Amino acid sequence: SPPVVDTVHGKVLGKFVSLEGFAQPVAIFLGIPFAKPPLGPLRFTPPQPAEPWSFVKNATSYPPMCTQDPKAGQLLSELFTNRKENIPLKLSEDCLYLNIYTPADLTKKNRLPVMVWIHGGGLMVGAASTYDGLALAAHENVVVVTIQYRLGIWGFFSTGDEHSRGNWGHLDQVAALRWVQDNIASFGGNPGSVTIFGESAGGESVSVLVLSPLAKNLFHRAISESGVALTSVLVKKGDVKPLAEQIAITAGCKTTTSAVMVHCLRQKTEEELLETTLKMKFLSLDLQGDPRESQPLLGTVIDGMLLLKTPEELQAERNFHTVPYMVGINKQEFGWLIPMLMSYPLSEGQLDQKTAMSLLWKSYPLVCIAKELIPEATEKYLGGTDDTVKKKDLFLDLIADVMFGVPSVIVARNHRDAGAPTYMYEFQYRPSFSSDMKPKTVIGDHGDELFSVFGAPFLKEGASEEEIRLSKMVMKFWANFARNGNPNGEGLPHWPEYNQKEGYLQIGANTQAAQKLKDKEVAFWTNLFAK
Amino acid sequence: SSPPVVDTVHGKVLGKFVSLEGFAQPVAIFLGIPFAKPPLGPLRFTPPQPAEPWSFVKNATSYPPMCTQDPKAGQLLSELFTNRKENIPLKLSEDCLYLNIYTPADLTKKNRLPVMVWIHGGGLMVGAASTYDGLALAAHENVVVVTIQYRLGIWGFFSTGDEHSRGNWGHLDQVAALRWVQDNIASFGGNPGSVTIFGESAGGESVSVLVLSPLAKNLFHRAISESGVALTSVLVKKGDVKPLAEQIAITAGCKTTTSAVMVHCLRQKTEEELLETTLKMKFLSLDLQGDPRESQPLLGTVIDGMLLLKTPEELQAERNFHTVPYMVGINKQEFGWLIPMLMSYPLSEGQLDQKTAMSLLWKSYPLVCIAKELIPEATEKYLGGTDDTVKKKDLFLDLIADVMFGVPSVIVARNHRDAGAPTYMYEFQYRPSFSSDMKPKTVIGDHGDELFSVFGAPFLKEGASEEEIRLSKMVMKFWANFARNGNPNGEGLPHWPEYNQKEGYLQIGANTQAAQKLKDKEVAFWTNLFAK
Amino acid sequence: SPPVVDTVHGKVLGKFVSLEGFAQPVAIFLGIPFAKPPLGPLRFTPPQPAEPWSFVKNATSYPPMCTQDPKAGQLLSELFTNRKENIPLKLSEDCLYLNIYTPADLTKKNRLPVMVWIHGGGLMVGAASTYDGLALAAHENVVVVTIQYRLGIWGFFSTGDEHSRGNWGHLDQVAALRWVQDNIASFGGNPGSVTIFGESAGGESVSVLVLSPLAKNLFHRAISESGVALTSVLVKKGDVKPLAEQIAITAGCKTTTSAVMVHCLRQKTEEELLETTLKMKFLSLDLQGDPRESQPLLGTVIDGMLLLKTPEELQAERNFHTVPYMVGINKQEFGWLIPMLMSYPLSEGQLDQKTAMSLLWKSYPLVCIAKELIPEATEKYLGGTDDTVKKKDLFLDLIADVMFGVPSVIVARNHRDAGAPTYMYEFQYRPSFSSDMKPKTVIGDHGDELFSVFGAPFLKEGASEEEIRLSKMVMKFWANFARNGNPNGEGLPHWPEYNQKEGYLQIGANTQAAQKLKDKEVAFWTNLFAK
Ligand SMILES: *[C@@H]1O[C@H](CO)[C@@H](O[C@H]2O[C@H](CO)[C@@H](O)[C@H](O)[C@H]2NC(C)=O)[C@H](O)[C@H]1NC(C)=O
Ligand SMILES: CC(=O)N[C@H]1[C@H]([C@H](O)[C@H](O)CO)O[C@@](O)(C(=O)O)C[C@@H]1O
């Protein structure tokens, strides 16, 4: 009969789902509320605990995804899902739910490691239901939890002061982790061993939680995939008041004071805030006016609750409570996916430096390179050869290194020097699940590792023995890390720890260890930004 | 100093004098003259009506607003296509049926200069007349330049397929502006007996549409279509238009019970709600999700029974159209950069394998209409010649350009010629210094590049080489000679052969010379392919 | 291939439908517009000519029915339709359409008689699509046309002055008759021979058209089935201003002036006017307050365009169209359907005079019998027996006679005395198509003749031979009347003309002639109301 688990707030009914090659059916619970719906006065406020229910709550239907651009959200889900057919999702402000995939025999007593997944999507789009934890759970014997949190205006609107601090979405992630602590034992998970992992904005969220005192003791291991707190495009520094006013004005609100803007925005309907979102044209590279004034995403701010100061300052603090941390990147972070989703103005296979400099300046919101420095940056990367074809490839490497490569290594180095176990990787592989619109030459594009991590080869059809093995290896590395804070194990290539030798693992068709990931790039960019 | 005051049928207008270096007679410029009644309220989705007469003098010296459209796309396109020094920021408004006049004539005396009426492009969804400054062309060639505006998007082309909302309101506005020219241009030193209509892209398709429409009879005497004709499928809705109409009404929160209900409901919506609906439909952007055959890139021309009695193809099969001198042209790389960029094509890698190419070509259905079964043959034909992946990408862009512009342009020219009318063709291949900085140096003759020569950008903007200056002078000469005689030829200019059975055409660029049989093989390949 | 006809405003495409045993198929055209949609500023104004269309208009789907109580309209359509299955109809203010059923060979030239049907429904509900003309058209070789007209508030709102005269629905009826004159020949119809017929409110409409100068030359024969201009409830006499104001107030409008009330009601959405309609509780007997103040329906008024004076004044003046006129009633007009639809308070097979008197006073809006006269009226109908079962039956008769019986005979008499051919009938048969909720004892209830007139026995599945025989005879009489202004013909029982002998036909399983229909009832009520 259907699995029924008892949680703090009430009973929940899930369903059993078997996976070829496993005798123990996985118990799946969809749409479990971990907080009170952020509706009405609750919009733009920290999450409150869910209210208890009387009988058995049916947890067998996908929850709606947080309000976001429905077309961009659906496209993204289609490109990222590990399941056979993408699941159409409904939109709603009532989205603070989480899905659980437990391989534990609930009739007995278990304490399996827990892996909490934080999806990406620039903090503007995305959903938990996009990711099916069936394969990872069944193959690695771990409890997989996929959570949701407020996005866009709903999750990050900030006036820069106490009337709307911001980071609601991040507070939601924290609320989910607190929920896991109080309830995961009932699903056969060990609250004493929770690993948080995510990619892109999800990786940046994990990185933020790692530096936050609010998340202390809510997790014991962390994994950031293609995204950290130093990925400047997701973190807003300085005064955020101007942005708040641009949003309120576009929404048809007065900007008399912070309290007035917030109060007015709380009165707007979901559709009105969604229409405001579309007018702001987020997720897109603005090619008009001054690049310095364009804000393609609404993200993390230094609110004073979640983050006491900038991530750059919080890293140097060699004494906070640490946890094993794995930080990785993909070979071509800006190879296709991101540029495509941002309508990046690149269509020619040949790029000249004059144009490169123009594009880089227009890319200010993503790279933050002062106009006076564009020449140096461009010359450093493109002055290499006289092949304009190779020049555009190097240009894509430049964006990638600034957005993910250098930030990741800098975070890893600081985590290491803080005395905590650190691991790094570089993923280079072109999955068969890639979009038909993605050139075959792109290898290790943003998000390419997700298919291996969530066992797509075991849910989706068609996959070479090589792709299947790669997924088994990756899931093993990730689950081993979940269990012991060390990815190593028998039958797996050796993954050196990221110490002073800066060893890291190159993951792909052929997997081996290497040293000094992005060494020269970090040196160059650190000196450039120093100016 | 003393501003020029002209007497129009509806009242007096006051303009301003502007001097262009190299000419004694200052050009009299009149901005924002209304040629129709503001299409507000119950007038939305109906034919344009005559402007109301006014007393005293109407000050015509401020740019009029551009018709309601995506403000970000509208403004960006304006910056990319303007020929003046600084782009003029424009206001949005449903009250947009205005035109600007640039007359080089001496209004104190009598003048009958040839008149050139410009119709801007922008997929019938965006654009403005003010983007194009007629000062240079007017002074340099002694012609009266008129830039007109017309309703765009929902306001200009919403159609229910029946009598409740036939559609083509934007084209009816173009007709009304031409009618205003006939009745008023003489007062500005123009000759209503010699009116030339020219436009680029959607503007070119409009010109082509006017050539095939009974409503435009005796309104123009010469025509020029630049990069766009009535056979550019994407702009001409063929088949049942009801589905698109219902989808627009639904998005606007309207019931679809009957056509009259849809129309009545949309008429009650505010300008902002319709603009929000427009932004939600996400027009002029490649939809990468779902079935490509359901994507609706834009709202456009329909066979309404008033403007167009039947499809363009049928109208030309039978020589049923205005046999005025016609110049049809294209640029070397129509889909080179500007359009793929504005439509958000996924070409960040700049390279492309055949499998990826067939995938995008299929997603490009709304633009090219190539059945999935035919994609392999179409792709093999263009990319199979080389193994280089970057080159393949270049050939892929040529393939899309040939289908949207190249082939349609030649087919139209041939039908116009075979109808015994004077026909001319050209292929523009040059990269202006006024190109966007984000546009690589390898893109030459991209969509819109010829506009800078036609409107004398080298004489209004700065940094033009002597070669570019010489090109613009030659092009304006050709265009104005054509406007004057229906033949572009003149002393001092390369010989431009007429597009007859020999199919001669002019290659315009750094090197300007006559050639023959433009896109001959391509027309043959595609005419056969589309026949299954 | 499909039938394509050329009409003044353009081409229309219909469809061929064959009837078992008929060689030539019937051409059917559904939803042809005969006027411009009465939307926006056209609400509460006379109908305007329809705009022409350019190609071929597809007229093969049923048009919507004019806005009205959706629950009530659907129920009524289901009870009256002659089709095998009732068609669900959509609501819309855009409802000025008509359906055509022509048995003619369109490839030739035909001049078949035309019968224009005006549906009933108290001028508050109803639809043309409820009535299928296939059978009547094929069996009698006549062109059948079913029309629609504005209903309720949209069709009859009147301020009592020039700012909103009222009777928009009747003007819509005139517009359709005008369209028939200009276009019917194209459908094989003869504009020189048009017969208008309807039942209930449609019967009253036909009666009003006979008295209106606006309809001269639009028809040549008329048939009123259970309803005439003397059926008081459908005709507003006196000052209509108070009702106008009550509707305005219910809709949230000010009543400062007529123009202000009209202008305000024009800005209301269809839904708002429908909600106002529901709050008014039309088509329902009000059991609260003074019976004299309740208005169960919005109807005809003496506007000065359609009607220049009350029917009574126009009859005395002998000022009207002297076309052949057939006027009939059913045995039990208030037998079940109407009392049921009005939520009439009667659930006992027995009724005492005291209760009867209270009910009759409550029925004021339907009968207009002053309270001081209630005793005499009641004593005259019930006082003859002690059987309280027979008393309630007699109570229903009294309502029926006052609403239909007497008014019909008086109208027949005035028409006869005006020198025009007149015929009367009394229908007494219980169709097998009656509702399952209608007691078997009710015979000749309101609307029962409709199934015979429209040939339900030929469209519905398996009707008894007796019922089939009755319908063939009725359609025969109706069609002979249509072509000759005299129903008589070969093989049909003799139907005497309604002259000084006052002969009329008793239609039923046994059809025979009789004399002096409701003669004593008319004498009684005429004397009573004269007080
Ligand atoms: C005319 O309209 C009808 C109804 O819209 C079309 O009929 C087809 O679709 C209807 C259901 O959506 C059905 O009622 C019809 O039975 C169905 N069959 C056909 C094709 O007749 C019809 O195609 C239209 N014809 C024209 C000339 O457009
Ligand atoms: C919306 C509108 O009508 N603006 C018009 C303005 C106003 O008339 C003036 O600013 C006076 O208010 O001036 C013009 O006519 C003009 O000078 O050419 C252009 C423009 O169309």
Ligand SMILES: Nc1c2c(nc3ccccc13)CCCC2
């Ligand atoms: N996944 C995305 C990320 C970023 N931008 C994006 C923009 C559009 C769609 C997806 C995105 C910025 C860096 C973090 C990841």
Ligand SMILES: Nc1c2c(nc3ccccc13)CCCC2
């Ligand atoms: N997106 C388009 C633009 C232009 N023409 C177009 C023609 C067809 C389809 C899309 C188009 C002209 C310049 C502005 C952009």
Ligand SMILES: Nc1c2c(nc3ccccc13)CCCC2
């Ligand atoms: N009140 C009346 C109702 C109906 N018809 C009527 C016909 C005439 C006069 C009053 C009527 C049909 C059913 C609903 C009520």
Ligand SMILES: *[C@@H]1O[C@H](CO)[C@@H](O)[C@H](O)[C@H]1NC(C)=O
């Ligand atoms: C739970 O809901 C699902 C549909 O989402 C349904 O299949 C199932 O019957 C429900 N369980 C119970 C017992 O309500």
Ligand SMILES: *[C@@H]1O[C@H](CO)[C@@H](O)[C@H](O)[C@H]1NC(C)=O
């Ligand atoms: C005409 O309009 C211009 C622009 O606003 C203004 O500067 C000028 O004073 C006006 N002249 C007249 C005639 O009012």
